[PDB]
Amino acid sequence: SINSREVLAEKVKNAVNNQPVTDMHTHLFSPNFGEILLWDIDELLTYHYLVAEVMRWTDVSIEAFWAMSKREQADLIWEELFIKRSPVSEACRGVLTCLQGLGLDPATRDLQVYREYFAKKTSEEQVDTVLQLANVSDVVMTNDPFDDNERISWLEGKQPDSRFHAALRLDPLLNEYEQTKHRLRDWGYKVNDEWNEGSIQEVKRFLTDWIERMDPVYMAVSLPPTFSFPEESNRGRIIRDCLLPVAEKHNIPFAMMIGVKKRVHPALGDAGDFVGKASMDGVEHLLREYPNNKFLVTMLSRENQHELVVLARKFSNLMIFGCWWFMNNPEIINEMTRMRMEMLGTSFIPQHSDARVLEQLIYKWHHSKSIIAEVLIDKYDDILQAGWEVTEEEIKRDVADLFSRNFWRFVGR
Amino acid sequence: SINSREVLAEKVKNAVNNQPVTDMHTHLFSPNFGEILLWDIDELLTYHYLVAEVMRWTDVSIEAFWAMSKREQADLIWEELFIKRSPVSEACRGVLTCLQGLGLDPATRDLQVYREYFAKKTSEEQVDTVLQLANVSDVVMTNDPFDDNERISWLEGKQPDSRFHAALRLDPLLNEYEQTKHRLRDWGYKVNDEWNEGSIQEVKRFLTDWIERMDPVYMAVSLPPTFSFPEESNRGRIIRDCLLPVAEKHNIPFAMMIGVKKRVHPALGDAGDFVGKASMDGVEHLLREYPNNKFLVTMLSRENQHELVVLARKFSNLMIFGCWWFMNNPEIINEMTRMRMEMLGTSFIPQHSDARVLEQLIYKWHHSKSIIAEVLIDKYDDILQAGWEVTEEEIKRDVADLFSRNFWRFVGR
Amino acid sequence: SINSREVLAEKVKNAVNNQPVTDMHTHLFSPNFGEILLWDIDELLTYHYLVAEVMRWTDVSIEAFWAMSKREQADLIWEELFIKRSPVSEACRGVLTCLQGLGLDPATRDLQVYREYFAKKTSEEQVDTVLQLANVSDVVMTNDPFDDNERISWLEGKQPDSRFHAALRLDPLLNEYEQTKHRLRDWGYKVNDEWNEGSIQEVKRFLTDWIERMDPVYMAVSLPPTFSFPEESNRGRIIRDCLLPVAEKHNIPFAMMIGVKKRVHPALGDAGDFVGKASMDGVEHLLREYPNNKFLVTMLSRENQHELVVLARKFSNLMIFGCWWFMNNPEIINEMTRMRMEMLGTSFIPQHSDARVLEQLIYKWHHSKSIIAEVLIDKYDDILQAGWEVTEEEIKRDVADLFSRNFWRFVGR
Amino acid sequence: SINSREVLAEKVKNAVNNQPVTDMHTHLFSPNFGEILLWDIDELLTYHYLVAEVMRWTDVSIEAFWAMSKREQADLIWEELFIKRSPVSEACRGVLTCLQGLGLDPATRDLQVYREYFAKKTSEEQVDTVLQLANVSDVVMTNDPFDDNERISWLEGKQPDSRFHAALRLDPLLNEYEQTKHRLRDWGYKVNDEWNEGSIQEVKRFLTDWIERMDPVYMAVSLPPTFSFPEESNRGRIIRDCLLPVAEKHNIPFAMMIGVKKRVHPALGDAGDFVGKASMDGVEHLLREYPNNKFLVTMLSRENQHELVVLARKFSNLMIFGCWWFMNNPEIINEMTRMRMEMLGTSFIPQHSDARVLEQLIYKWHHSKSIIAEVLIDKYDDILQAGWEVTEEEIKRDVADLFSRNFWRFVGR
Numbered sequence A, B, C, D: 001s002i003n004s005r006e007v008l009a010e011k012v013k014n015a016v017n018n019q020p021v022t023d024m025h026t027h028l029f030s031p032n033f034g035e036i037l038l039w040d041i042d043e044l045l046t047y048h049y050l051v052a053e054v055m056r057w058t059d060v061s062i063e064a065f066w067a068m069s070k071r072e073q074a075d076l077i078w079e080e081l082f083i084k085r086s087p088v089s090e091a092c093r094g095v096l097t098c099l100q101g102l103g104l105d106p107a108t109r110d111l112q113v114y115r116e117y118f119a120k121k122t123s124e125e126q127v128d129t130v131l132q133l134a135n136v137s138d139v140v141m142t143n144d145p146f147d148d149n150e151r152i153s154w155l156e157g158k159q160p161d162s163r164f165h166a167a168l169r170l171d172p173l174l175n176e177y178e179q180t181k182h183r184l185r186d187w188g189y190k191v192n193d194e195w196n197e198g199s200i201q202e203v204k205r206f207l208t209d210w211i212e213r214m215d216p217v218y219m220a221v222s223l224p225p226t227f228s229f230p231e232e233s234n235r236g237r238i239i240r241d242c243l244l245p246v247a248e249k250h251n252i253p254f255a256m257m258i259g260v261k262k263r264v265h266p267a268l269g270d271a272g273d274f275v276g277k278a279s280m281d282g283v284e285h286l287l288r289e290y291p292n293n294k295f296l297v298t299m300l301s302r303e304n305q306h307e308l309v310v311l312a313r314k315f316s317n318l319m320i321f322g323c324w325w326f327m328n329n330p331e332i333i334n335e336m337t338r339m340r341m342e343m344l345g346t347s348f349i350p351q352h353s354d355a356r357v358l359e360q361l362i363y364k365w366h367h368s369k370s371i372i373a374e375v376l377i378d379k380y381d382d383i384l385q386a387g388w389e390v391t392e393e394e395i396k397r398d399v400a401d402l403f404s405r406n407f408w409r410f411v412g413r
């Protein structure tokens, strides 16, 4: 038996640390796709999360910033966020966790020496190194066929190795149909200006074609805080008449990341998005009215978190996942994971990395695993006190479900 | 006087665990009322909180589940939530706490043996046992005159034990007046199709009649997130012209449990209710415009909790109570109780059990007391460090107010 | 070298304790303004925060309360909140902390003796004593030219000493222009009936004249949950045509304190204000459309805190500050500071005292600094463990930024 | 590098735990030697250290105790020292650590179940199991040619396996020559009544004969607190004319375990020995006057420990080792190890187990490694603080010296 919390803590920490992770949502790509897979210290430092932060300190105008080279940008952020002020924020701390994990020494602050480490490795080598360090066995990518560069790679035979899984990202189709319908036509999908049977079948064809070419684990889309459903709009009709039925047929879950308010600050680029609390009505309707469809949902507002958990108690076809973007900070990750486990036990997916830069897998999982471990230790200790006798194998089992099995079990694969 | 956190913690925990509890809201009934009072391990396992949870895991269809016998359902839940996955959720932990409390040993996981304990015992007995273990001196029931079985009971003179108190629940009357008014007719209450003096006075008779028959400590109603007041609706009118004036006459408080969205998932039965954030406008209005009325309030949305505390700072005729339903989880209980004590001192009612099954009193109060004691220890220790000295007597006094006195003083009994 | 959390806790606690504080928002006044500057134990006990709290207990009518003398009220509150029940609330705790900090001993509960301390001392002496004990180097006041007593003081030549700075509060002008315009004309400002060039120019003259006279660090206003911008109202036009242009010319930041619902309980006086969640739309617009203007923002609703931080991530012309009013409680201060640091690093102002009574400076900063120090320890420890070198000089630098430099840096002074 | 004490601690603990141990003094025997190798829970419970302790509580006479069967003695000790009083003593704590280490569960206190674990294993199997758990690579036995049983095993040609090493124990020869000389004669060693050339040569012959048969890593003897040298006694002459000369020729060190006063309480058997402070004169003389001889020393009196460390500072032919018997308690092990490291760096052997029962290897080493690890963390931290940069490889090296290499390097094998 586990006679003390101290022994329980060590055992839980070991289980969590040893458990290979399936990162069900990232912005990483199989290395064979080429330069689109971003990596190295300069990429880590230029992560848009750090761009927003540096802009709060530097005198360098945003225009000037974008005009600088990748190396110059990295130098500026290093100086502004690490040298001039202690790198205490979550994103800055993450850069340090990566460096340390790669065997580099943050104590020297020798940026040139860190760069040299990367300059002598191939992408294939760095992916092997990182996946081993972060103990990540499977990476789910975000594949947007509407992006010209991504589309051409797929059309020209590019396929990911077994460690990388595809996910059909449909933001342009679902949120900008008025513009996107023209491109569908240019690609041979005869969508009409009237939402008729022809338009429905062609949008379905598009989805089916890409499902066949990508073999996605799920279809996804990020939605605004004003998201509602049903709705007489292109989004409402495409979801209802095309997406859901196609998803039901192939038994592919629909991933909705709700709460992002796009481009409140255009100049910042990828760092210019904001957040807003959403109504749960649209989500509630979808789960109740489409019982044969699977939905993976993560929300951006802190104020949506608790009710999202309650909604998960209502419908089994709802699998909530991760602590997304602005929620991906220790204070939030902790409260979210606790409310989730208290109302759902182990029937959820606590985290994903959303890694845009390869090395981030190291800090994203290291930082989150330590928090999730502390939650588990409290929960296990609580039942041990109630007289329950939890075993190490059961612990390893629960941990496997949280970090990998629940996802694969849900996507039905 | 106490001059160390060590001794302080000793005395606080002692006062808290020794303090006789008055559960000012439950779904239990004096044992003389018969079977309506649920109890035993099978009832604990089939609590709807656990029904919602098992459905997220089990392959069994909700139809087949409802088709199963009580025993069969319990066995399914025990297997799905306790054996196949660690029973870490608050609801599952609660069952274990209950068993351990009764002397049973969760370490064995011998569901059969646990079952035998209850068999060889009677309702009258188990109530004495449970009330002894949970150290609860008074239990406030939820008495719905609109329920047939329950109604006939009060009609036949059935009086509840002196340790069980009555609460007049009016959900059907205030939320479904249109369908309810017809039943009011059948009971000699001549309500008119229109809201005239005739209808107003008959609704009052209905209320006054039951107040006499039940001698309730308060009248209660659960409301939706969209609750508004004033409001040109039956609820708005019935509350304004009947409930309020009557309540003020008998000097009886009005308990409003706001935030529940009923039947979002009909098939789940009692486990099918959801939650939503409410506007404080209505409660603000009621408290201000009706100073001679006493209001007991509790809300279901995590996002309503802080402003409710602030509202309690504004109006003394407002007494906030407990961490209701989806709020009844350690993470929320802790933050709620701390915000409350920081802005209200000891002028609020920290908790109620909402027990639907007798034994639940054990875990409900055990889990809550441990959290409440911790909060008290920190707050006492903070003033202790400022030089203030607290006596054990003052501690028992304070603990008395929180777990029993504030309620009786508020209702005026 | 700082090579452990233990050593770090020491250095951080020391740094925070020794860092002189610039309180960028208070209701204190330079001693040479006389009466208006409140102080002593009777004033502390009658802080409106404690009034609201006593009214939740004392059966003394609010009318009677206001009818009695300062000392009578102080005696009642002390009796009701310190003797009748342990003074565990934040506001009561504060009273005790101020006493101890002054040398008085709360263990004795000798109110009479505490009073003798203040009786034999001048105002000039008490400010010197308090500013020293609270380690506060600069105090920003709230100067409302619409208050007859304050306005006449400025008009007659009253100037604050080196330690007190002015802040031009404009609530009457922006939120009550209909009644206020009549007073502007009485003072020579020819604002017309319709919002035309003449009205715009005179309102500007009004602001400019007062900017010359007070030389304020910033212009301020408290706003309701329903605040919006742009908006066709006097507030919206005054801000758009008058406030912003003037603020930009003199490079004076605009301080918006959003979320207060005034007078939901008029009888309580200053203690009768409530809170409500606001939309971020207005703030988002102001920041994006007026890049040459600087904004200081703090919000009253707990539910606005997280999204306000994200907004700060989008705009560098936004500087968020403090845990205002109902947010100024440990539980909230803690969660707010951690969310801010995690997403903003050190680019924010964690706190302000909002002191109405001089002595409060002692407890406001002592209670807050302890929480902020603990947050810092956690954040520094996280990067230390990640391999980062943290020097005592860098800690002092960061601490100095948070408690003083960020403010002066933002205001351009 | 090692940036923090927390990381240093993890690395030191790991190095220490992972380092295979050479236990240079035990009372264990290679399994092929027979039943002389004691093992199992009953042997653990009847360890003489526990016999002395039980006699302080039990009403059972020492005579009756010796009359009981081994199983009965074990039952009594378990009841008296573990059940009737908490097993907080070091020797009792040790029994528990062994049980836990073997996978058994101390929480059940099921002595019968623990016994079942041992009945199904063979000596050779338990040796493999224990050496693995305790991470002991090499064991030094105590081989007494004067014990009939053991002597026969050697005369038969039995050899210990590669994991076990011999040490020629000479207590009978050196301390009881008058009686022992008669046995030397029966064995062919023609020693005379007078200490002449013949006696000296036969004694030497006896030593050489056994050194050739055992190939001991050292010759050893336990001495009384009155030990002196030079000395005109059989011990002084045998050491001067036989032991030392032989030891030099074979380059074999002489181990002296000084401070034991034998049989102060005869009836207690092996548990009847006491302790006394010794003069350092004889050891000082031996070290200085016999520079070509190597000496391994350990002393029993707490009051001899510091001066022994200082003596090691004077002579390189002196190797001090372990915390012997009455010194083998946490409080002493810690103060000893700290004085030794502070005055000798890593030039000493911190510990040996003195295990009489096989399983004790588990607790002796587990208990000592944790203390030693703590001392090392402190010392490394102090030099890290002085700017030194210790590497993980240097730590492993230092650890190997302390737990293994220093010994083998000193005995030149």
Ligand SMILES: O=C(O)[C@@H](O)C(O)[C@H](O)C(=O)O
Pocket: A027, A142, A222, A257, A270, A325, A354, A356
């Ligand atoms: O980096 C991010 O998290 C965002 O910029 C987006 O990639 C977001 O995660 C999304 O998937 O839409």
Ligand SMILES: O=C(O)[C@@H](O)C(O)[C@H](O)C(=O)O
Pocket: B027, B142, B222, B257, B270, B325, B354, B356
């Ligand atoms: O179990 C519960 O708490 C709910 O299902 C209801 O009983 C709720 O508490 C209510 O009283 O409306």
Ligand SMILES: O=C(O)[C@@H](O)C(O)[C@H](O)C(=O)O
Pocket: C027, C142, C222, C257, C270, C325, C354, C356
């Ligand atoms: O005491 C308070 O904080 C309030 O009553 C107001 O002074 C508020 O701080 C404001 O500045 O409007």
Ligand SMILES: O=C(O)[C@@H](O)C(O)[C@H](O)C(=O)O
Pocket: D027, D222, D257, D270, D325, D354, D356
């Ligand atoms: O168990 C013991 O440590 C003693 O009884 C002796 O074995 C002593 O260690 C010795 O070697 O003489």
Ligand SMILES: [Cl-]
Pocket: A277, A303, B277, B303, C277, C303
């Ligand atoms: Cl909200």
Ligand code: NA
Pocket: A335, B335, C335
């Ligand atoms: Na919290």
Ligand SMILES: [Zn+2]
Pocket: A025, A026, A027, A142, A354
């Ligand atoms: Zn993403």
Ligand SMILES: [Zn+2]
Pocket: B025, B026, B027, B142, B354
């Ligand atoms: Zn209820």
Ligand SMILES: [Zn+2]
Pocket: C025, C026, C027, C142, C354
């Ligand atoms: Zn203020």
Ligand SMILES: [Zn+2]
Pocket: D025, D026, D027, D142, D354
């Ligand atoms: Zn020995």
